[PDB]
């Protein structure tokens, strides 16, 4: 039970700047050396930066030296990263890890927050039912889903009966709309007989534009 | 900058089977070597560190070795959990600096996808335009063709198809075809068909309704 949670991800203007949080639990923060890390998407990993645990010793990529200031609050225990100057390849996942001792291979990651540099503008996904049909229908089970179109940027989430139902469910990568939107299927196969007795609900959240919605699917 | 390189890039095996993955670097980098695992979409993990050295609460069948610029990390009996890649990382001299990533898929026996068709919604068809889904599920492997027809018209306008990750549970791959028309189009014709090729499959397989 030690983790790192970043938060502080989403859309942002070129030219423009953002910062992240890498707020860490489990441990003694304060005496580690962390690092934050990126991955632009059809790309592997690349160091961002690292900070001492002094707080008082940074480095930086080639990429982002004078523009991106690593830093730390040891008190509130959390690690920061202030982009300045964003471009459209700075596109990608940040993860901060922390250092291991002896000293060098990152020890613990955190999940990983997608920033997306664009100047096109949020939108809000709609939700449509994928209803359960005897055409969506195979022997004691059953298929239904969501259908969530159109919303810009990348990450959309989708649970099934608020997490009651986790199972049964593939939810699928997203596509870009020859529009410059997304869209994605979120699907799950449920026992044929309940049909009629349970009532399934997907919860779709996009906090990007902050559109929360659910949809009751229902048969026919 | 010490610029790694990973072996096979790909590698599919069948779950029980020994798994093998290289790590060449451009330069000795001696002992120093990292190895991470990242099932998507999570945090990387370190398996291992210092080349032979196993990260604490990893599983035993993952070990590493080699030595100077060659490395091999190893999954002694490869399970389907296991799917991911698999990152190593250099630390010897500045910068720190990573593999390109090797993609371990679990080959498993065939299974053919139970193929699924979902008209509209009227709600949809309400604001403007009309998605027709056409659901794969639980196939293996992972190629799989699926063409549109509109009465019987072949269609090259215009679907969008998407693939999930291998089950970790039962290695298997689901996907979903949008068949993607104007409401104006979609009362313009009868029948509604996606036909899916599959190795999995004696022949192929069509799915229809009419409206």
């Known amino acids: 039970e030690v983790q790192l949670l970043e938060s502080g991800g989403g859309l942002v203007q070129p030219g423009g700047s953002l910062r992240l949080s890498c707020a860490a639990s489990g441990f003694t923060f304060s005496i580690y050396p962390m690092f934050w890390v990126r991955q632009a998407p059809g790309k592997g990993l690349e160091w961002v930066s690292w900070?001492?645990?002094?707080?008082?010793?940074?480095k930086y990529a080639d990429s982002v030296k004078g523009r991106f200031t690593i830093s730390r609050d040891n008190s509130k225990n959390t690690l920061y990263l202030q982009m300045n100057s964003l471009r459209a390849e700075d596109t990608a996942t940040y993860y901060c890890?922390?250092?291991?001792?002896?000293?060098?291979?990152?020890?613990?990651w955190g999940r990983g927050t997608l920033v997306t540099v664009s100047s096109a503008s949020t939108k809000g996904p709609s939700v449509f039912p994928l209803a359960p049909s005897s055409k969506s229908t195979s022997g004691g089970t059953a298929a239904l889903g969501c259908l969530v179109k159109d919303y810009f940027p990348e990450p959309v989430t989708v649970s099934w009966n608020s997490g009651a139902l986790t199972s049964g469910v593939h939810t699928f990568p997203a596509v870009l709309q020859s529009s410059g939107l997304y869209s994605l299927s979120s699907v799950v196969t449920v026992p044929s007989s309940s049909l009629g007795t349970q009532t399934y609900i997907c919860n779709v959240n996009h906090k990007p534009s902050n559109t929360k919605v659910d949809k009751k699917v229902e048969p026919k | 900058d010490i610029q790694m390189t990973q072996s096979p890039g790909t590698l599919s095996l069948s779950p029980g089977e020994r798994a093998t993955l290289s790590c060449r670097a451009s330069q000795s980098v001696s002992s120093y070597l990292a190895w991470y695992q990242q099932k998507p979409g999570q945090a990387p993990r370190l398996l291992i560190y210092?080349?032979?050295n196993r990260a604490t609460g990893i599983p035993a069948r993952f070990s590493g070795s080699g030595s100077g610029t060659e490395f091999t990390l190893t999954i002694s009996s490869l399970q389907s959990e296991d799917f991911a890649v698999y990152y190593c990382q250099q630390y010897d001299k500045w910068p720190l600096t990573f593999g390109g990533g090797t993609k371990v898929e679990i080959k498993r026996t065939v299974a053919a996808p139970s193929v699924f068709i979902f008209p509209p919604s009227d709600e949809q068809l309400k604001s403007g335009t009309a998605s027709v889904v056409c659901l794969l599920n639980n196939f293996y492997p992972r190629e799989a063709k699926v063409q549109w027809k509109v009465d019987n018209a072949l269609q090259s306008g215009n679907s969008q198809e998407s693939v999930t990750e291998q089950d970790s549970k039962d290695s298997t791959y689901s996907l979903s075809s949008t068949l993607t028309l104007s409401k104006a189009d979609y009362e313009k014709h009868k029948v509604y068909a996606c036909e899916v090729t599959h190795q999995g499959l004696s022949s192929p397989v069509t799915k229809s309704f009419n409206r």
């Open positions: 900070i001492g645990p002094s707080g008082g010793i940074t």
């Open positions: 890890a922390r250092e291991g001792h002896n000293d060098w291979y990152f020890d613990l």
């Open positions: 210092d080349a032979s």
